[PDB]
Structure 1
Amino acid sequence: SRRNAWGNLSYADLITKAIESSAEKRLTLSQIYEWMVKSVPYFKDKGDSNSSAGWKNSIRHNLSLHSKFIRVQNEGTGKSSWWMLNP
C-alpha cells in the first residue's frame, strides 16, 4: 500500500534524487520536471502541462519551502534559476 501513486518517496525526496543525478549537481526548475517524467513511471505520461499542474505546483512548493534546497544564480539571459542541494 503505497503512500503515493508513485510509491513512498516524497516530492522533496524525489527532487533530491533529481538534483543529485546531475553532473554539476544542479538543475533549473524546467529540468526537474523533465527528470520526473523520464525517471518516475507515475509521471512518464504527465508532461502535458495540460494534465500537469498539480505535481508541478507541489514540486515548486517543496523547492521554495524546505531549506534543504537553495536557489543559485545561473548566468545567462532568459535562463531560470539553478536549484541545488543546500550543504
Structure 2
Amino acid sequence: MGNLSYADLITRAIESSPDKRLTLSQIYEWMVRCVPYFKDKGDSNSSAGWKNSIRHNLSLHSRFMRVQNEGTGKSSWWIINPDGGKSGKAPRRRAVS
C-alpha cells in the first residue's frame, strides 16, 4: 500500500461501477485487476488473508451496508450509506469479554 487503506480501496471500487453495486467476487476482481499491488485472482488465482481482510472492513465501519434480493437466490450487493449527514461515533472497540 503506497498511500491508501483497505477501507478506502473498497469504498473506491464500489464508487466507479456502471451502477453502484459490487460483490465480493466483483470487488475481489477490482483489487486483483487494478493497482499493481494485488495479484491473486488475475490470470491465475488466490493469495492469503487480504481475502479475509476486505470482508472485515466492509462489515465493520459505516460506509458499507449490504443488500440482498428477497427472492430465492444470492444477490448480495455492497453499497455505501449516509452521505448527507456526517456525525455518528462507531463504538470504537474494547469494553470487554
TM range, smaller chain: 0.7 to 0.9
Question: What is the identity percentage for the equivalent residue pairs of Structure 1 and Structure 2?
Answer: 82
Report the equivalent of 1:32: 27
TM-score by length of 1: 0.79
Q: How many residues align?
A: 79
TM-score by length of 2: 0.72
Secondary structure of the residue that 2:37 maps to in structure 1? helix
Q: Check 1:75–1:29 CA distance in 2 against 1; reply closer, same or farther (3 A cut).
A: farther
Report the equivalent of 2:76: 81
Report the equivalent of 1:65: 60
> Which has the larger share of helix?
1
Q: Check 1:7–1:70 CA distance in 2 against 1; reply closer, same or farther (3 A cut).
A: same
Report the equivalent of 2:85: none
Q: Check 1:56–1:41 CA distance in 2 against 1; reply closer, same or farther (3 A cut).
A: same
Bigger shift: 54-63 or 72-81? 72-81
Ranges in structure 2 where 5+ consecutive residues have no aligned partner: 83-97
